[PDB]
Write a protein that binds this ligand. Structure first.
Ligand SMILES: *[C@@H]1O[C@H](CO)[C@@H](O[C@@H]2O[C@H](CO)[C@@H](O)[C@H](O)[C@H]2NC(C)=O)[C@H](O)[C@H]1NC(C)=O
Lengths: 50, 49
């Protein structure tokens, strides 16, 4: 049996006997992490004997 | 409520078994509930939110 009116947007659904609820609890979580690292090190010498 | 053409038994709709469409009245023009009213039915866990 069943045949209670269940809608999502304009689309109407027939729920299974087994299912208590199927309901559009919409949600969204985005997550962005960017980590850039640089190191440089320079070493020189110049040395002369005459 | 029997043979309203509305399923007034919640899950079973037993008030609408073997019910003649000649006896079913046009109980209402429409049956679309407000667009997410079922969520108002839900319970809430006040600790976990
Ligand atoms: C070692 O000597 C070289 C050559 O003089 C140096 O490089 C020169 O540096 C001058 C000034 O900055 C520039 O005008 C030249 O074009 C460079 N030439 C070359 C080939 O690099 C260098 O800097 C010196 N290093 C140290 C640690 O003294």
């Amino acid at each position: 049996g069943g045949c209670s009116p269940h809608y999502i947007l304009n689309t109407r659904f027939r729920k299974p006997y087994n299912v208590e609820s199927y309901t559009p609890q919409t949600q969204g979580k985005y997550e962005f992490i960017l980590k850039e690292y640089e190191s440089y090190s320079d070493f020189e010498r110049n040395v002369t004997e005459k | 409520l029997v043979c309203n053409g509305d399923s007034d038994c919640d899950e079973d709709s037993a008030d609408e078994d073997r019910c003649e469409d000649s006896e079913r009245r046009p109980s209402c023009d429409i049956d679309k509930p407000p667009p997410n009213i079922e969520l108002t039915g839900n319970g809430y866990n006040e600790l976990t939110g």
